[PDB]
Write an enzyme that holds these catalytic residues in place. Structure first.
Site, PDB file in Angstrom:
ATOM      1  N   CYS A  92      34.421  64.817  -2.318  1.00 37.97           N
ATOM      2  CA  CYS A  92      34.860  65.595  -1.665  1.00 37.97           C
ATOM      3  C   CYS A  92      36.168  66.286  -2.469  1.00 37.97           C
ATOM      4  O   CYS A  92      36.249  67.381  -2.518  1.00 37.97           O
ATOM      5  CB  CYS A  92      35.256  65.382  -0.157  1.00 37.97           C
ATOM      6  SG  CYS A  92      36.232  64.032   0.126  1.00 37.97           S
ATOM      7  N   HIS A 252      39.209  62.844   3.924  1.00 34.70           N
ATOM      8  CA  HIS A 252      38.178  63.787   3.492  1.00 34.70           C
ATOM      9  C   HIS A 252      38.955  65.456   3.078  1.00 34.70           C
ATOM     10  O   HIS A 252      39.603  65.703   3.919  1.00 34.70           O
ATOM     11  CB  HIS A 252      37.172  64.000   4.691  1.00 34.70           C
ATOM     12  CG  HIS A 252      35.945  64.964   4.218  1.00 34.70           C
ATOM     13  ND1 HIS A 252      35.252  64.781   3.258  1.00 34.70           N
ATOM     14  CD2 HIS A 252      35.534  65.853   4.835  1.00 34.70           C
ATOM     15  CE1 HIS A 252      34.480  65.573   2.939  1.00 34.70           C
ATOM     16  NE2 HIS A 252      34.332  66.292   4.129  1.00 34.70           N
ATOM     17  N   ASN A 272      33.209  72.898   4.907  1.00 33.40           N
ATOM     18  CA  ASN A 272      32.935  71.463   4.515  1.00 33.40           C
ATOM     19  C   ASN A 272      31.962  71.461   3.435  1.00 33.40           C
ATOM     20  O   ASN A 272      31.740  72.671   2.967  1.00 33.40           O
ATOM     21  CB  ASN A 272      32.476  70.609   5.763  1.00 33.40           C
ATOM     22  CG  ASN A 272      32.602  69.162   5.637  1.00 33.40           C
ATOM     23  OD1 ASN A 272      33.206  68.541   4.783  1.00 33.40           O
ATOM     24  ND2 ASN A 272      32.307  68.399   6.873  1.00 33.40           N
TER      25      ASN A 272
END
Ligand SMILES: *[C@@H]1O[C@H](CO)[C@@H](O[C@@H]2O[C@H](CO)[C@@H](O[C@@H]3O[C@H](CO)[C@@H](O)[C@H](O)[C@@H]3O)[C@H](O)[C@H]2NC(C)=O)[C@H](O)[C@H]1NC(C)=O
Ligand SMILES: *[C@@H]1O[C@H](CO)[C@@H](O[C@@H]2O[C@H](CO)[C@@H](O)[C@H](O)[C@H]2NC(C)=O)[C@H](O)[C@H]1NC(C)=O
Length: 308
Positions: A92, A252, A272
Protein backbone atom coordinates in the site's frame (compact mmCIF):
# COMPACT_ATOMS: atom_id res chain seq x y z
CA UNK A 1 -4.57 -16.70 12.10
CA UNK A 2 -6.11 -18.79 9.22
CA UNK A 3 -9.35 -18.16 11.21
CA UNK A 4 -11.67 -15.61 9.52
CA UNK A 5 -11.57 -11.95 10.82
CA UNK A 6 -15.36 -11.31 10.25
CA UNK A 7 -18.59 -13.00 11.55
CA UNK A 8 -22.32 -12.07 11.46
CA UNK A 9 -22.05 -11.64 15.31
CA UNK A 10 -19.06 -9.16 15.02
CA UNK A 11 -20.67 -7.12 12.15
CA UNK A 12 -24.06 -6.89 13.99
CA UNK A 13 -22.36 -5.45 17.16
CA UNK A 14 -20.40 -2.97 14.89
CA UNK A 15 -23.70 -1.81 13.24
CA UNK A 16 -25.16 -1.21 16.76
CA UNK A 17 -21.98 0.48 18.35
CA UNK A 18 -21.52 2.84 15.26
CA UNK A 19 -25.23 4.06 15.73
CA UNK A 20 -25.93 3.85 11.92
CA UNK A 21 -23.46 6.70 10.93
CA UNK A 22 -21.76 4.03 8.69
CA UNK A 23 -22.78 0.53 7.47
CA UNK A 24 -20.73 -2.68 7.94
CA UNK A 25 -21.56 -5.87 5.94
CA UNK A 26 -20.72 -9.58 6.75
CA UNK A 27 -21.77 -11.14 3.37
CA UNK A 28 -19.82 -8.49 1.33
CA UNK A 29 -16.53 -9.05 -0.57
CA UNK A 30 -14.29 -9.81 2.51
CA UNK A 31 -16.63 -12.31 4.32
CA UNK A 32 -13.92 -15.08 4.36
CA UNK A 33 -10.61 -13.06 4.66
CA UNK A 34 -8.23 -14.61 7.27
CA UNK A 35 -6.42 -12.64 10.05
CA UNK A 36 -3.11 -13.30 8.13
CA UNK A 37 -4.60 -12.05 4.75
CA UNK A 38 -6.07 -8.85 6.45
CA UNK A 39 -2.74 -8.08 8.26
CA UNK A 40 -0.68 -8.50 4.96
CA UNK A 41 -2.87 -5.72 3.31
CA UNK A 42 -1.57 -3.13 5.90
CA UNK A 43 2.10 -2.59 4.97
CA UNK A 44 3.11 0.80 6.54
CA UNK A 45 6.28 0.36 8.71
CA UNK A 46 7.93 3.60 10.08
CA UNK A 47 10.13 13.24 13.55
CA UNK A 48 9.81 13.35 9.68
CA UNK A 49 12.80 13.25 7.19
CA UNK A 50 10.76 15.54 4.81
CA UNK A 51 10.34 19.33 5.44
CA UNK A 52 6.83 20.60 6.37
CA UNK A 53 4.82 22.27 3.53
CA UNK A 54 5.10 26.11 3.62
CA UNK A 55 2.04 27.79 1.95
CA UNK A 56 2.52 31.21 0.28
CA UNK A 57 0.56 34.23 1.60
CA UNK A 58 -1.85 33.74 -1.40
CA UNK A 59 -2.32 29.98 -0.74
CA UNK A 60 -3.01 30.74 2.98
CA UNK A 61 -5.89 33.25 2.27
CA UNK A 62 -7.92 31.14 -0.27
CA UNK A 63 -11.41 30.55 1.21
CA UNK A 64 -11.73 26.71 0.87
CA UNK A 65 -15.19 25.34 -0.13
CA UNK A 66 -17.43 23.27 2.19
CA UNK A 67 -16.95 20.29 -0.20
CA UNK A 68 -14.26 19.36 -2.83
CA UNK A 69 -13.63 16.52 -5.36
CA UNK A 70 -10.26 16.20 -7.25
CA UNK A 71 -11.89 14.46 -10.30
CA UNK A 72 -14.40 17.43 -10.61
CA UNK A 73 -11.59 20.07 -10.11
CA UNK A 74 -9.31 18.40 -12.79
CA UNK A 75 -11.87 16.69 -15.15
CA UNK A 76 -9.20 16.24 -17.95
CA UNK A 77 -7.04 14.00 -15.62
CA UNK A 78 -8.18 10.36 -16.23
CA UNK A 79 -5.87 8.73 -13.54
CA UNK A 80 -7.65 10.53 -10.64
CA UNK A 81 -10.86 8.35 -10.70
CA UNK A 82 -8.95 5.01 -11.39
CA UNK A 83 -8.74 2.56 -8.38
CA UNK A 84 -5.60 0.43 -7.71
CA UNK A 85 -5.34 -3.24 -6.57
CA UNK A 86 -2.24 -3.98 -4.38
CA UNK A 87 -3.16 -7.73 -4.69
CA UNK A 88 -1.92 -10.24 -1.99
CA UNK A 89 1.09 -8.09 -0.93
CA UNK A 90 1.81 -5.41 1.79
CA UNK A 91 2.57 -2.75 -0.90
CA UNK A 92 0.00 0.00 0.00
CA UNK A 93 2.89 2.41 0.95
CA UNK A 94 4.21 2.13 -2.68
CA UNK A 95 0.81 1.76 -4.47
CA UNK A 96 -0.72 4.90 -2.81
CA UNK A 97 2.51 6.87 -3.60
CA UNK A 98 2.61 5.85 -7.32
CA UNK A 99 -1.17 6.60 -7.75
CA UNK A 100 -0.81 10.22 -6.39
CA UNK A 101 2.44 10.72 -8.48
CA UNK A 102 0.45 9.72 -11.67
CA UNK A 103 -2.33 12.22 -10.61
CA UNK A 104 0.24 15.00 -9.92
CA UNK A 105 1.87 14.54 -13.42
CA UNK A 106 -1.51 15.83 -14.78
CA UNK A 107 -2.31 18.54 -12.12
CA UNK A 108 1.32 19.99 -12.15
CA UNK A 109 3.69 18.04 -14.50
CA UNK A 110 2.17 18.82 -17.96
CA UNK A 111 1.44 15.09 -18.68
CA UNK A 112 -2.23 14.06 -19.15
CA UNK A 113 -1.93 10.24 -18.69
CA UNK A 114 1.11 8.42 -17.23
CA UNK A 115 0.91 5.63 -14.61
CA UNK A 116 4.03 5.62 -12.37
CA UNK A 117 5.19 2.03 -11.60
CA UNK A 118 4.26 0.97 -8.03
CA UNK A 119 6.29 -2.26 -8.78
CA UNK A 120 9.55 -0.33 -9.51
CA UNK A 121 9.13 1.61 -6.19
CA UNK A 122 8.33 -1.63 -4.22
CA UNK A 123 11.43 -3.55 -5.47
CA UNK A 124 14.15 -0.85 -5.99
CA UNK A 125 13.74 1.40 -2.85
CA UNK A 126 15.46 -0.72 -0.07
CA UNK A 127 15.88 2.60 1.86
CA UNK A 128 11.98 2.58 2.04
CA UNK A 129 11.77 -0.85 3.79
CA UNK A 130 11.27 -4.54 2.75
CA UNK A 131 8.93 -4.52 -0.31
CA UNK A 132 5.74 -6.62 0.18
CA UNK A 133 6.54 -6.85 4.00
CA UNK A 134 5.97 -3.03 4.24
CA UNK A 135 7.74 0.38 4.06
CA UNK A 136 7.66 4.21 4.68
CA UNK A 137 5.57 6.57 2.47
CA UNK A 138 7.88 9.55 3.38
CA UNK A 139 10.92 7.70 1.88
CA UNK A 140 8.88 6.67 -1.25
CA UNK A 141 8.57 10.40 -2.17
CA UNK A 142 12.27 11.08 -1.28
CA UNK A 143 13.25 8.27 -3.76
CA UNK A 144 10.95 9.83 -6.45
CA UNK A 145 13.14 13.04 -6.03
CA UNK A 146 16.65 11.56 -5.61
CA UNK A 147 16.46 8.60 -8.11
CA UNK A 148 13.12 8.60 -10.03
CA UNK A 149 10.78 5.84 -11.28
CA UNK A 150 9.69 4.29 -14.62
CA UNK A 151 6.06 4.12 -15.88
CA UNK A 152 3.60 1.19 -15.64
CA UNK A 153 4.11 0.85 -19.45
CA UNK A 154 7.85 0.10 -18.81
CA UNK A 155 7.21 -2.17 -15.70
CA UNK A 156 3.59 -3.35 -15.27
CA UNK A 157 2.54 -4.18 -11.62
CA UNK A 158 3.72 -7.82 -11.32
CA UNK A 159 0.70 -9.17 -9.27
CA UNK A 160 -2.74 -9.76 -10.89
CA UNK A 161 -6.17 -8.42 -9.79
CA UNK A 162 -7.58 -10.94 -7.26
CA UNK A 163 -10.98 -11.07 -5.41
CA UNK A 164 -11.76 -12.18 -1.79
CA UNK A 165 -15.21 -13.12 -3.29
CA UNK A 166 -15.10 -16.89 -4.20
CA UNK A 167 -17.18 -15.95 -7.35
CA UNK A 168 -16.06 -12.39 -8.48
CA UNK A 169 -18.29 -10.10 -10.70
CA UNK A 170 -15.11 -9.08 -12.73
CA UNK A 171 -13.92 -12.76 -12.87
CA UNK A 172 -10.56 -12.22 -11.01
CA UNK A 173 -8.95 -15.34 -9.43
CA UNK A 174 -9.39 -15.74 -5.61
CA UNK A 175 -6.70 -13.94 -3.42
CA UNK A 176 -6.53 -17.14 -1.24
CA UNK A 177 -4.44 -18.97 -3.98
CA UNK A 178 -1.73 -16.17 -3.78
CA UNK A 179 1.08 -15.10 -1.32
CA UNK A 180 3.68 -12.92 -3.17
CA UNK A 181 7.28 -11.92 -2.19
CA UNK A 182 9.09 -8.66 -3.17
CA UNK A 183 9.83 -8.62 -6.95
CA UNK A 184 13.36 -8.39 -8.48
CA UNK A 185 14.60 -4.76 -9.12
CA UNK A 186 15.08 -4.23 -12.94
CA UNK A 187 16.79 -1.22 -14.69
CA UNK A 188 15.23 -1.64 -18.21
CA UNK A 189 11.55 -2.37 -19.21
CA UNK A 190 9.94 -5.86 -18.74
CA UNK A 191 9.57 -5.97 -22.59
CA UNK A 192 13.09 -5.11 -23.81
CA UNK A 193 11.80 -3.44 -27.08
CA UNK A 194 10.16 -0.65 -24.95
CA UNK A 195 12.60 2.26 -24.24
CA UNK A 196 13.00 3.55 -20.62
CA UNK A 197 11.46 6.99 -19.82
CA UNK A 198 12.68 8.20 -16.35
CA UNK A 199 10.21 10.35 -14.27
CA UNK A 200 11.45 12.41 -11.24
CA UNK A 201 10.09 15.03 -8.70
CA UNK A 202 12.16 18.18 -7.82
CA UNK A 203 10.80 18.49 -4.22
CA UNK A 204 9.10 16.35 -1.48
CA UNK A 205 7.29 17.58 1.73
CA UNK A 206 4.92 16.50 4.60
CA UNK A 207 1.35 17.65 5.53
CA UNK A 208 -0.04 17.64 9.17
CA UNK A 209 -3.66 18.43 10.18
CA UNK A 210 -7.00 19.28 8.52
CA UNK A 211 -6.03 22.75 7.07
CA UNK A 212 -2.78 21.39 5.49
CA UNK A 213 -4.83 18.54 3.83
CA UNK A 214 -7.65 20.71 2.34
CA UNK A 215 -5.28 23.53 1.18
CA UNK A 216 -2.71 21.13 -0.48
CA UNK A 217 -5.51 19.04 -2.19
CA UNK A 218 -7.20 22.25 -3.52
CA UNK A 219 -4.00 23.72 -5.12
CA UNK A 220 -2.03 20.56 -6.17
CA UNK A 221 -4.34 17.46 -6.04
CA UNK A 222 -4.33 13.98 -4.44
CA UNK A 223 -1.53 12.90 -2.03
CA UNK A 224 -0.62 9.94 0.27
CA UNK A 225 -1.94 9.64 3.89
CA UNK A 226 -1.74 6.69 6.37
CA UNK A 227 -3.98 5.48 9.25
CA UNK A 228 -4.43 2.61 11.78
CA UNK A 229 -6.65 -0.27 10.45
CA UNK A 230 -8.96 -2.04 12.99
CA UNK A 231 -10.94 -5.28 12.24
CA UNK A 232 -14.23 -3.26 11.85
CA UNK A 233 -12.82 -1.30 8.80
CA UNK A 234 -12.42 -4.63 6.83
CA UNK A 235 -16.28 -4.99 6.85
CA UNK A 236 -16.89 -1.30 5.74
CA UNK A 237 -19.58 -0.86 3.02
CA UNK A 238 -20.89 2.79 3.09
CA UNK A 239 -21.14 6.10 5.05
CA UNK A 240 -18.49 7.88 7.20
CA UNK A 241 -16.24 5.37 9.09
CA UNK A 242 -15.07 5.77 12.72
CA UNK A 243 -13.48 2.90 14.80
CA UNK A 244 -15.93 1.31 17.34
CA UNK A 245 -14.65 -2.35 17.53
CA UNK A 246 -11.90 -4.95 16.78
CA UNK A 247 -8.10 -5.52 17.16
CA UNK A 248 -5.40 -3.38 15.37
CA UNK A 249 -4.20 -5.02 12.06
CA UNK A 250 -1.40 -2.47 11.20
CA UNK A 251 -0.81 0.87 9.38
CA UNK A 252 -2.25 1.36 5.84
CA UNK A 253 -1.37 4.02 3.19
CA UNK A 254 -4.18 5.51 0.99
CA UNK A 255 -4.77 8.35 -1.57
CA UNK A 256 -6.83 11.38 -0.34
CA UNK A 257 -9.06 12.91 -3.14
CA UNK A 258 -11.71 15.12 -1.41
CA UNK A 259 -13.78 16.24 1.60
CA UNK A 260 -17.47 16.98 2.37
CA UNK A 261 -20.43 16.77 4.80
CA UNK A 262 -22.91 13.81 4.94
CA UNK A 263 -25.92 14.78 7.21
CA UNK A 264 -23.74 16.98 9.54
CA UNK A 265 -20.77 14.48 9.65
CA UNK A 266 -17.60 16.04 8.12
CA UNK A 267 -15.51 13.50 6.10
CA UNK A 268 -12.49 12.76 3.87
CA UNK A 269 -13.17 10.92 0.55
CA UNK A 270 -10.36 8.36 0.10
CA UNK A 271 -9.28 5.94 -2.65
CA UNK A 272 -8.29 2.52 -1.16
CA UNK A 273 -6.14 0.01 -3.19
CA UNK A 274 -8.37 -3.13 -2.73
CA UNK A 275 -10.05 -2.82 -6.24
CA UNK A 276 -13.61 -1.53 -7.03
CA UNK A 277 -15.55 -4.48 -5.40
CA UNK A 278 -14.71 -3.27 -1.83
CA UNK A 279 -16.48 -0.27 -0.14
CA UNK A 280 -18.07 2.50 -2.31
CA UNK A 281 -16.74 1.32 -5.75
CA UNK A 282 -13.21 1.27 -4.22
CA UNK A 283 -13.60 4.51 -2.13
CA UNK A 284 -14.44 5.03 1.59
CA UNK A 285 -15.45 8.11 3.64
CA UNK A 286 -13.80 8.53 7.11
CA UNK A 287 -14.57 11.16 9.88
CA UNK A 288 -12.69 14.52 9.46
CA UNK A 289 -11.53 16.92 12.26
CA UNK A 290 -10.55 14.53 15.17
CA UNK A 291 -7.57 12.67 13.43
CA UNK A 292 -9.74 9.46 13.23
CA UNK A 293 -7.35 6.42 13.39
CA UNK A 294 -4.47 8.97 13.11
CA UNK A 295 -5.33 9.83 9.43
CA UNK A 296 -4.42 13.56 9.97
CA UNK A 297 -1.01 12.85 11.68
CA UNK A 298 1.10 12.68 8.45
CA UNK A 299 0.78 13.13 4.67
CA UNK A 300 3.54 12.80 1.99
CA UNK A 301 3.64 14.74 -1.33
CA UNK A 302 5.95 16.17 -4.02
CA UNK A 303 6.09 18.13 -7.31
CA UNK A 304 6.85 16.17 -10.51
CA UNK A 305 9.27 17.65 -13.08
CA UNK A 306 7.96 18.06 -16.70
CA UNK A 307 9.80 15.55 -19.03
CA UNK A 308 12.45 16.46 -21.71
C1 LIG B 1 11.68 -7.63 -12.90
O1 LIG B 1 11.92 -8.66 -13.80
C2 LIG B 1 11.39 -9.94 -13.45
C3 LIG B 1 11.41 -10.67 -14.79
O2 LIG B 1 12.78 -11.00 -14.95
C4 LIG B 1 9.97 -9.98 -12.85
O3 LIG B 1 9.80 -11.21 -12.12
C5 LIG B 1 8.91 -12.12 -12.75
O4 LIG B 1 7.57 -11.73 -12.50
C6 LIG B 1 6.66 -12.52 -13.27
C7 LIG B 1 5.28 -11.90 -13.14
O5 LIG B 1 5.15 -10.98 -14.24
C8 LIG B 1 6.72 -13.97 -12.81
O6 LIG B 1 5.86 -14.78 -13.63
C9 LIG B 1 4.87 -15.52 -12.87
O7 LIG B 1 5.39 -16.76 -12.36
C10 LIG B 1 4.51 -17.55 -11.55
C11 LIG B 1 5.25 -18.85 -11.12
O8 LIG B 1 6.64 -18.63 -10.77
C12 LIG B 1 3.15 -17.83 -12.27
O9 LIG B 1 2.09 -17.91 -11.28
C13 LIG B 1 2.63 -16.77 -13.28
O10 LIG B 1 1.97 -17.41 -14.40
C14 LIG B 1 3.64 -15.71 -13.78
O11 LIG B 1 4.05 -15.95 -15.14
C15 LIG B 1 8.14 -14.48 -12.91
O12 LIG B 1 8.23 -15.77 -12.30
C16 LIG B 1 9.15 -13.55 -12.24
N1 LIG B 1 10.48 -14.05 -12.60
C17 LIG B 1 11.61 -13.94 -11.89
C18 LIG B 1 12.80 -14.58 -12.55
O13 LIG B 1 11.68 -13.38 -10.82
C19 LIG B 1 9.73 -8.87 -11.86
O14 LIG B 1 8.33 -8.88 -11.51
C20 LIG B 1 10.22 -7.56 -12.47
N2 LIG B 1 10.12 -6.47 -11.51
C21 LIG B 1 9.12 -5.59 -11.52
C22 LIG B 1 9.23 -4.48 -10.50
O15 LIG B 1 8.17 -5.66 -12.29
C1 LIG C 1 -17.32 -17.47 1.84
O1 LIG C 1 -17.29 -18.90 1.78
C2 LIG C 1 -18.55 -19.60 1.76
C3 LIG C 1 -18.28 -21.08 1.53
O2 LIG C 1 -17.12 -21.54 2.24
C4 LIG C 1 -19.47 -19.06 0.65
O3 LIG C 1 -20.85 -19.54 0.71
C5 LIG C 1 -21.14 -20.58 -0.28
O4 LIG C 1 -20.99 -20.17 -1.66
C6 LIG C 1 -21.05 -21.29 -2.57
C7 LIG C 1 -20.66 -20.86 -3.98
O5 LIG C 1 -19.33 -20.32 -3.97
C8 LIG C 1 -22.46 -21.88 -2.58
O6 LIG C 1 -22.33 -23.27 -2.95
C9 LIG C 1 -23.26 -21.75 -1.26
O7 LIG C 1 -24.43 -20.94 -1.52
C10 LIG C 1 -22.54 -21.17 -0.02
N1 LIG C 1 -22.39 -22.22 1.00
C11 LIG C 1 -22.45 -22.04 2.32
C12 LIG C 1 -22.14 -23.26 3.14
O8 LIG C 1 -22.70 -20.97 2.85
C13 LIG C 1 -19.51 -17.55 0.74
O9 LIG C 1 -20.35 -17.04 -0.29
C14 LIG C 1 -18.10 -16.97 0.64
N2 LIG C 1 -18.24 -15.52 0.60
C15 LIG C 1 -17.74 -14.74 -0.36
C16 LIG C 1 -18.27 -13.34 -0.34
O10 LIG C 1 -16.96 -15.11 -1.23
Amino acid sequence: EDAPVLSKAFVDRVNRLNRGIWKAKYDGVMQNITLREAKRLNGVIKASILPKRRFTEEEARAPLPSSFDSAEAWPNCPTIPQIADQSACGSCWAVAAASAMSDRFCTMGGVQDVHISAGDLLACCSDCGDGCNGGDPDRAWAYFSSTGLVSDYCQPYPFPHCSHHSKSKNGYPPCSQFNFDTPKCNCTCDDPTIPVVNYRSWTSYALQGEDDYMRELFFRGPFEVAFDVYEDFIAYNSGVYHHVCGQYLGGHAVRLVGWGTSNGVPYWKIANSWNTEWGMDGYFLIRRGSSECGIEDGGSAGIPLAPN
